[PDB]
Enzyme design. Structure first.
Site, PDB file in Angstrom:
ATOM      1  N   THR C  15     -31.476 -41.065   2.347  1.00  0.00           N
ATOM      2  CA  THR C  15     -31.774 -41.927   1.212  1.00  0.00           C
ATOM      3  C   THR C  15     -30.907 -41.642  -0.011  1.00  0.00           C
ATOM      4  O   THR C  15     -30.848 -42.482  -0.917  1.00  0.00           O
ATOM      5  CB  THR C  15     -33.267 -41.828   0.852  1.00  0.00           C
ATOM      6  N   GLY C  17     -27.071 -39.394  -1.467  1.00  0.00           N
ATOM      7  CA  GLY C  17     -25.961 -38.477  -1.262  1.00  0.00           C
ATOM      8  C   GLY C  17     -25.238 -38.697   0.052  1.00  0.00           C
ATOM      9  O   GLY C  17     -24.925 -39.826   0.444  1.00  0.00           O
ATOM     10  N   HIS C  39     -39.530 -39.263  -0.528  1.00  0.00           N
ATOM     11  CA  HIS C  39     -39.944 -40.216  -1.549  1.00  0.00           C
ATOM     12  C   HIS C  39     -39.800 -41.632  -1.004  1.00  0.00           C
ATOM     13  O   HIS C  39     -38.693 -42.068  -0.666  1.00  0.00           O
ATOM     14  CB  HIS C  39     -39.120 -40.016  -2.820  1.00  0.00           C
ATOM     15  N   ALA C  63     -38.475 -33.350   7.182  1.00  0.00           N
ATOM     16  CA  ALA C  63     -37.788 -32.801   8.344  1.00  0.00           C
ATOM     17  C   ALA C  63     -38.439 -31.530   8.865  1.00  0.00           C
ATOM     18  O   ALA C  63     -38.268 -31.208  10.044  1.00  0.00           O
ATOM     19  CB  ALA C  63     -36.311 -32.541   8.026  1.00  0.00           C
ATOM     20  N   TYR C 155     -29.515 -20.119   1.598  1.00  0.00           N
ATOM     21  CA  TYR C 155     -28.704 -21.242   2.054  1.00  0.00           C
ATOM     22  C   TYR C 155     -27.644 -20.790   3.060  1.00  0.00           C
ATOM     23  O   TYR C 155     -27.481 -21.408   4.122  1.00  0.00           O
ATOM     24  CB  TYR C 155     -28.051 -21.905   0.844  1.00  0.00           C
ATOM     25  N   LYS C 159     -27.293 -22.115   6.940  1.00  0.00           N
ATOM     26  CA  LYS C 159     -26.119 -22.835   7.415  1.00  0.00           C
ATOM     27  C   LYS C 159     -25.350 -22.046   8.468  1.00  0.00           C
ATOM     28  O   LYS C 159     -24.711 -22.655   9.335  1.00  0.00           O
ATOM     29  CB  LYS C 159     -25.209 -23.187   6.240  1.00  0.00           C
ATOM     30  N   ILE C 190     -19.364 -31.728  -2.541  1.00  0.00           N
ATOM     31  CA  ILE C 190     -19.389 -33.188  -2.482  1.00  0.00           C
ATOM     32  C   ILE C 190     -20.263 -33.684  -3.630  1.00  0.00           C
ATOM     33  O   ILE C 190     -21.361 -33.166  -3.842  1.00  0.00           O
ATOM     34  CB  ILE C 190     -19.970 -33.705  -1.148  1.00  0.00           C
ATOM     35  N   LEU C 194     -27.708 -33.625  -5.230  1.00  0.00           N
ATOM     36  CA  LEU C 194     -27.875 -32.176  -5.126  1.00  0.00           C
ATOM     37  C   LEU C 194     -26.933 -31.446  -6.074  1.00  0.00           C
ATOM     38  O   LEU C 194     -27.344 -30.521  -6.784  1.00  0.00           O
ATOM     39  CB  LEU C 194     -27.646 -31.717  -3.682  1.00  0.00           C
ATOM     40  N   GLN C 251      -8.197 -20.761   2.074  1.00  0.00           N
ATOM     41  CA  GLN C 251      -7.692 -19.615   1.313  1.00  0.00           C
ATOM     42  C   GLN C 251      -8.711 -18.483   1.298  1.00  0.00           C
ATOM     43  O   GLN C 251      -9.885 -18.684   1.662  1.00  0.00           O
ATOM     44  CB  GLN C 251      -7.350 -20.026  -0.117  1.00  0.00           C
TER      45      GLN C 251
HETATM   46  N1  LIG Z   1     -23.356 -31.825  -1.620  1.00  0.00           N
HETATM   47  C1  LIG Z   1     -22.627 -30.814  -1.147  1.00  0.00           C
HETATM   48  O1  LIG Z   1     -21.692 -30.341  -1.775  1.00  0.00           O
HETATM   49  C2  LIG Z   1     -22.918 -30.260   0.223  1.00  0.00           C
HETATM   50  C3  LIG Z   1     -21.965 -29.404   0.767  1.00  0.00           C
HETATM   51  C4  LIG Z   1     -22.175 -28.890   2.037  1.00  0.00           C
HETATM   52  C5  LIG Z   1     -23.329 -29.250   2.719  1.00  0.00           C
HETATM   53  N2  LIG Z   1     -24.242 -30.075   2.176  1.00  0.00           N
HETATM   54  C6  LIG Z   1     -25.398 -30.397   3.006  1.00  0.00           C
HETATM   55  O2  LIG Z   1     -25.399 -31.809   3.200  1.00  0.00           O
HETATM   56  C7  LIG Z   1     -26.741 -32.251   3.383  1.00  0.00           C
HETATM   57  C8  LIG Z   1     -26.979 -33.371   2.374  1.00  0.00           C
HETATM   58  O3  LIG Z   1     -26.821 -32.819   1.067  1.00  0.00           O
HETATM   59  P1  LIG Z   1     -26.712 -33.765  -0.222  1.00  0.00           P
HETATM   60  O4  LIG Z   1     -25.806 -33.081  -1.210  1.00  0.00           O
HETATM   61  O5  LIG Z   1     -26.419 -35.189   0.196  1.00  0.00           O
HETATM   62  O6  LIG Z   1     -28.242 -33.658  -0.699  1.00  0.00           O
HETATM   63  P2  LIG Z   1     -29.026 -34.610  -1.753  1.00  0.00           P
HETATM   64  O7  LIG Z   1     -28.068 -35.351  -2.642  1.00  0.00           O
HETATM   65  O8  LIG Z   1     -30.051 -33.708  -2.383  1.00  0.00           O
HETATM   66  O9  LIG Z   1     -29.788 -35.597  -0.759  1.00  0.00           O
HETATM   67  C9  LIG Z   1     -30.769 -35.001   0.079  1.00  0.00           C
HETATM   68  C10 LIG Z   1     -31.406 -36.069   0.933  1.00  0.00           C
HETATM   69  O10 LIG Z   1     -32.280 -35.408   1.840  1.00  0.00           O
HETATM   70  C11 LIG Z   1     -33.628 -35.793   1.549  1.00  0.00           C
HETATM   71  N3  LIG Z   1     -34.513 -34.635   1.772  1.00  0.00           N
HETATM   72  C12 LIG Z   1     -34.630 -33.518   1.025  1.00  0.00           C
HETATM   73  N4  LIG Z   1     -35.547 -32.683   1.576  1.00  0.00           N
HETATM   74  C13 LIG Z   1     -36.023 -33.269   2.694  1.00  0.00           C
HETATM   75  C14 LIG Z   1     -37.001 -32.942   3.756  1.00  0.00           C
HETATM   76  N5  LIG Z   1     -37.703 -31.787   3.748  1.00  0.00           N
HETATM   77  N6  LIG Z   1     -37.183 -33.849   4.740  1.00  0.00           N
HETATM   78  C15 LIG Z   1     -36.517 -35.012   4.775  1.00  0.00           C
HETATM   79  N7  LIG Z   1     -35.608 -35.375   3.846  1.00  0.00           N
HETATM   80  C16 LIG Z   1     -35.330 -34.554   2.810  1.00  0.00           C
HETATM   81  C17 LIG Z   1     -33.617 -36.324   0.133  1.00  0.00           C
HETATM   82  O11 LIG Z   1     -34.663 -37.274  -0.016  1.00  0.00           O
HETATM   83  P3  LIG Z   1     -36.104 -36.797  -0.576  1.00  0.00           P
HETATM   84  O12 LIG Z   1     -35.803 -35.846  -1.708  1.00  0.00           O
HETATM   85  O13 LIG Z   1     -36.697 -38.119  -1.014  1.00  0.00           O
HETATM   86  O14 LIG Z   1     -36.791 -36.175   0.610  1.00  0.00           O
HETATM   87  C18 LIG Z   1     -32.266 -36.986   0.080  1.00  0.00           C
HETATM   88  O15 LIG Z   1     -32.342 -38.244   0.758  1.00  0.00           O
HETATM   89  C19 LIG Z   1     -27.630 -31.032   3.188  1.00  0.00           C
HETATM   90  O16 LIG Z   1     -27.927 -30.476   4.484  1.00  0.00           O
HETATM   91  C20 LIG Z   1     -26.757 -30.070   2.412  1.00  0.00           C
HETATM   92  O17 LIG Z   1     -27.112 -28.711   2.666  1.00  0.00           O
HETATM   93  C21 LIG Z   1     -24.055 -30.603   0.950  1.00  0.00           C
HETATM   94  O1  LIG Z   2     -20.738 -25.655  -0.389  1.00  0.00           O
HETATM   95  C1  LIG Z   2     -21.659 -26.175  -0.914  1.00  0.00           C
HETATM   96  C2  LIG Z   2     -21.769 -26.573  -2.394  1.00  0.00           C
HETATM   97  C3  LIG Z   2     -20.881 -26.439  -3.469  1.00  0.00           C
HETATM   98  C4  LIG Z   2     -21.256 -26.902  -4.724  1.00  0.00           C
HETATM   99  C5  LIG Z   2     -22.507 -27.488  -4.925  1.00  0.00           C
HETATM  100  C6  LIG Z   2     -23.387 -27.620  -3.856  1.00  0.00           C
HETATM  101  C7  LIG Z   2     -23.008 -27.157  -2.590  1.00  0.00           C
HETATM  102  C8  LIG Z   2     -23.747 -27.172  -1.245  1.00  0.00           C
HETATM  103  O2  LIG Z   2     -24.832 -27.604  -1.061  1.00  0.00           O
HETATM  104  N1  LIG Z   2     -22.885 -26.559  -0.269  1.00  0.00           N
HETATM  105  O3  LIG Z   2     -23.168 -26.370   1.072  1.00  0.00           O
HETATM  106 MG   LIG Z   3     -11.725 -17.730   1.357  1.00  0.00          MG
END
Ligand SMILES: NC(=O)c1ccc[n+]([C@@H]2O[C@H](COP(=O)([O-])OP(=O)(O)OC[C@H]3O[C@@H](n4cnc5c(N)ncnc54)[C@H](OP(=O)(O)O)[C@@H]3O)[C@@H](O)[C@H]2O)c1
Ligand SMILES: O=C1c2ccccc2C(=O)N1O
Ligand SMILES: [Mg+2]
Ligand SMILES: NC(=O)c1ccc[n+]([C@@H]2O[C@H](COP(=O)([O-])OP(=O)(O)OC[C@H]3O[C@@H](n4cnc5c(N)ncnc54)[C@H](OP(=O)(O)O)[C@@H]3O)[C@@H](O)[C@H]2O)c1
Ligand SMILES: NC(=O)c1ccc[n+]([C@@H]2O[C@H](COP(=O)([O-])OP(=O)(O)OC[C@H]3O[C@@H](n4cnc5c(N)ncnc54)[C@H](OP(=O)(O)O)[C@@H]3O)[C@@H](O)[C@H]2O)c1
Ligand SMILES: NC(=O)c1ccc[n+]([C@@H]2O[C@H](COP(=O)([O-])OP(=O)(O)OC[C@H]3O[C@@H](n4cnc5c(N)ncnc54)[C@H](OP(=O)(O)O)[C@@H]3O)[C@@H](O)[C@H]2O)c1
Ligand SMILES: O=C1c2ccccc2C(=O)N1O
Ligand SMILES: [Mg+2]
Lengths: 252, 251, 251, 253
Positions: C15, C17, C39, C63, C155, C159, C190, C194, C251
């Site tokens: 929903t 990101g 939500h 989840a 975290y 991961k 990204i 979050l 790096q």
């Molecule tokens: N952004 C980054 O830089 C980054 C980098 C590496 C990895 N990731 C990974 O990528 C994935 C997505 O991250 P994002 O940055 O897109 O997160 P985000 O912007 O916080 O979006 C999270 C999404 O997951 C939902 N969510 C949260 N808790 C949940 C639960 N218990 N059950 C079901 N849905 C849930 C949220 O909706 P509700 O809050 O309404 O449930 C929202 O739709 C995550 O696994 C994160 O660890 C992100």
């Molecule tokens: O590597 C990252 C990161 C960098 C900066 C902000 C959030 C995040 C996250 O959720 N992961 O996995």
């Molecule tokens: Mg390194």
């Protein structure tokens, strides 16, 4: 207790300065006979006796890229101390150029030492040490630059990645054929050596927490002690693996 | 000279197998050692097999018992002085694919293999930082923290978690000048009661397609790399992975 | 031409990101998608922003809710037919070192980031195997499954667990001819809610010493590698790690 | 999708006349790129180009990747045909079935001249020719699973593919830090059915063993073509310095 390298006979290329010097020092301290090599016989001769007498350590002038000299080097060590058990391919050079900025002469010169030399020592080490029950160990000096890239060390990166994987090939073949030879790589982070000392501001740059999390660079003894572990029968189940001593550099 | 002179070590699951050998060689190198395990009879016989209460003692503690961890440190410190070295070695296995893993199997294995390592690392940092002890936390992962195994899904999860969580701790300790290092050890197959009780395990993992050396390791193979990591010889090693596996992951 | 023709995907956390963009580009390439989230208002809007109930729908599901996973698959199957694709994307963060992590925080994060991916992977294998679907499970890890972060201890654990657990599942599925692939995606930083909600995070990770490209990525950067992994184009890719991170881990 | 994923790209694919490189060239053209394929044998090369399309979309240039001076002519020829190069696939490579112990120095030097020096020449020149032009440039260096794990009977090849793996990271970092708009990534195929494999007696059977490739079969050239399309497309604009492994599970165990 007892010497951890009892009865071992080791060649340490580039063993007259820096990391290779400390490796030779701690190898002798643990009961091994050591032959160090280097190109400058002046520097190399005083280096040898700084560690001990000729009953435990000797110097042999040899460029690691000298293929024929490798056969003479094994012969000289063998007649001095007995069958070689341990080869530390430590000789290497650096070139501060991006891939884009590397001349082909720089590329070929670095790789002749850092890759071909390691190949010559590993190949001959297997031929000369296999099937003799020696607990033989080949220790190839890679670098953290065999694990991560550096924008200003393109040729060096190539050489150290090559050493990293070529060593696994050798380790597997020796294991599958019951050669009683192990092959492992050591990956130092920044270490205070002449190589680092002569690069202007290198130690301060690599002491940044964004580079080395410990906030300082290591010392040659830090690499010596992991090579002692790897040369010893303590590590008889370790082969084909990467041993990283780098202050956390690659952990972030 | 003793390579672990003045070190005081907690070794979880130190009554059998790898942990027993780590304890044995730690004492051999001058450390004072507390070993833990769930079964007291096995534990007291283990400690006395290595030495007397002047060098080694057994404490009954389940590594998943969070509150017990503070008592374990307190007990170790009263007998031997400040803890310098924590070896999070206690761990269990489950022979199940991800597909076939029950949730109770999942939770049980992770409570020991992951939560237990977290409890000892977190408390180890708190109790050992900023004391100039040359502190070292050695977390036991596995080759199964580097590669998958189709029949050990929960175990794979736990050991991959330990692998990367330990890098977080290593970095924080380094950046804060805590004088605490954190590293992971990744054994290949090792002849231990875990492997002995699994029918046909040693024969399977001695296949050259599994372990290139054609045999499995022995507990002392892991003890000696832990000696290196507990000693000041390894004062520049942190956040890194130490693989002792007969070539298993090199192919 | 549709690269995901005939595919039916569950995208958890779809929903906002990254998950939102994955669902977006999945529908664009011909997939029918169920997105989940907690939500309901945000979730209904997310679905309506991509298309109508003929191509995409929202299901309220946490989840970490094991029993809800069975209802989620059942609901998706009745809507769109047999599920072919599972994107375990739901995840949360906690800004604490290992030393400073409370057990409450530890358990909360791992319940979503680890147990949730386990529930989705285990059930996905059970429900998609042996059906000629070209099935694909895409588990969202991170660069933080590859390197440590001193302020993201739990975290990092979660991961790293996802990284290696997914290899176990990939191997079992491949060896048993299940016609299910399992791979992990490792985004660098990204721009998502979050990150936006974490004060100063984008500025910190845009430093050249963190992300060499000097900026963080966008959700579509992860959507497109997920389209590749969900598509039959990647029929020989399993057990592998797909890193889209601006150079962060090089790096 | 509804649009050519490589619209406007101009690609050089070394070793593009058979096997993996031919499939890369084929799918590059399908996605709207203009392609120059290279190889040593002009009979094979000219037929390969015509099998994919006309000279408006694809051309053959006879070039040995170890020939440094020829790299300059190759880029010159490509620009004259199609305009500024945007995409370089360093795919030409050879193999040698020898353990490290049994590798002759001649075999060592010959393989590394192609597999390592050739990739260096093409990466260095690609950066010089594509930097700072807003092309969304992409250099794709063909490593292998043998740049990730060892093979007891491919010592020199292992060395070459490990070198390609880490040298590419150096180039990726420099390009990123300098805002060159050039990405550099490596592709690591597992066993793929190509002339290289077909001509190695028993190789496909050996690598189809479950203990080697868990999927129980080897891949096909299109498997590598499609990840190369992703890497050359602006879809992958945040991917640099990374390793893309397409190997049937080989390295996951
Ligand atoms: N952004 C980054 O830089 C980054 C980098 C590496 C990895 N990731 C990974 O990528 C994935 C997505 O991250 P994002 O940055 O897109 O997160 P985000 O912007 O916080 O979006 C999270 C999404 O997951 C939902 N969510 C949260 N808790 C949940 C639960 N218990 N059950 C079901 N849905 C849930 C949220 O909706 P509700 O809050 O309404 O449930 C929202 O739709 C995550 O696994 C994160 O660890 C992100
Ligand atoms: O590597 C990252 C990161 C960098 C900066 C902000 C959030 C995040 C996250 O959720 N992961 O996995
Ligand atoms: Mg390194
Ligand atoms: N220092 C670091 O931060 C660091 C980090 C990671 C890895 N390494 C690696 O560790 C090894 C040792 O580096 P170091 O810092 O100790 O370097 P150093 O201080 O420059 O010492 C190099 C030694 O190698 C010898 N040598 C150089 N070229 C040679 C050749 N062609 N044949 C034989 N011997 C040769 C030198 O003697 P001559 O001058 O007399 O030939 C000298 O004894 C190298 O492989 C290096 O790449 C170093
Ligand atoms: N053996 C291998 O091939 C191998 C390879 C790689 C990694 N490892 C890892 O190495 C570690 C040691 O394994 P091992 O093979 O030596 O195992 P083992 O022979 O089964 O010994 C396990 C030890 O841990 C103790 N233990 C079990 N559960 C415990 C708990 N909840 N709290 C505290 N102690 C507990 C056992 O004593 P009680 O039963 O009395 O508690 C015993 O002393 C484990 O983390 C394992 O995952 C093993
Ligand atoms: N097949 C696999 O399983 C596999 C797995 C991992 C990686 N790889 C890598 O993938 C790449 C392609 O392999 P492939 O299996 O498709 O090989 P292949 O079937 O042997 O095709 C090789 C292509 O490269 C050309 N070539 C060979 N030597 C050359 C040189 N010196 N200069 C220019 N072109 C040259 C060949 O044409 P000419 O003979 O006319 O020159 C042919 O077009 C290689 O880098 C290989 O290392 C292959
Ligand atoms: O060239 C090859 C090859 C041929 C046959 C089987 C596996 C492989 C491999 O991994 N590379 O790189
Ligand atoms: Mg393997």
């Amino acid at each position: 207790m007892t010497d951890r390298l009892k009865g071992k006979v080791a060649i340490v290329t580039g063993g007259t300065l820096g990391i290779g010097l400390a490796i030779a020092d701690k190898f002798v301290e643990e009961g091994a006979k050591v032959v160090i090599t280097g190109r400058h016989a002046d520097v190399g001769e005083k280096a040898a006796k700084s560690i001990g007498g000729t009953d435990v350590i000797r110097f042999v002038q040899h460029d690691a890229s000298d293929e024929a000299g490798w056969t003479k080097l094994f012969d000289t060590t063998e007649e001095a101390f007995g069958p070689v058990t341990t080869v530390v391919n430590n000789a290497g050079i650096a070139v501060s150029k991006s891939v884009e900025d590397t001349t082909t002469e720089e590329w070929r010169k670095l790789l002749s030492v850092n890759l071909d030399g390691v190949f010559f020592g590993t190949r001959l080490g297997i031929q000369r040490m296999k099937n003799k029950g020696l607990g033989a160990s080949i220790i190839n000096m890679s670098s953290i630059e065999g694990l991560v890239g550096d924008p200003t060390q393109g040729a060096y990166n190539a050489s150290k990645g090559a050493v990293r994987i070529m060593s696994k090939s050798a380790a597997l073949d020796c294991a599958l054929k019951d050669y009683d030879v192990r092959v492992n790589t050591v990956h130092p982070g920044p270490i205070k050596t002449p190589l680092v000392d002569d690069a202007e501001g290198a130690e301060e740059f690599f002491s940044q927490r964004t580079k080395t999390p410990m906030g300082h660079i290591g010392e040659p003894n830090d690499i010596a002690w992991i090579c002692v572990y790897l040369a010893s029968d303590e590590s008889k189940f370790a082969t084909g693996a990467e041993f990283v001593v780098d202050g956390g550099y690659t952990a972030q």
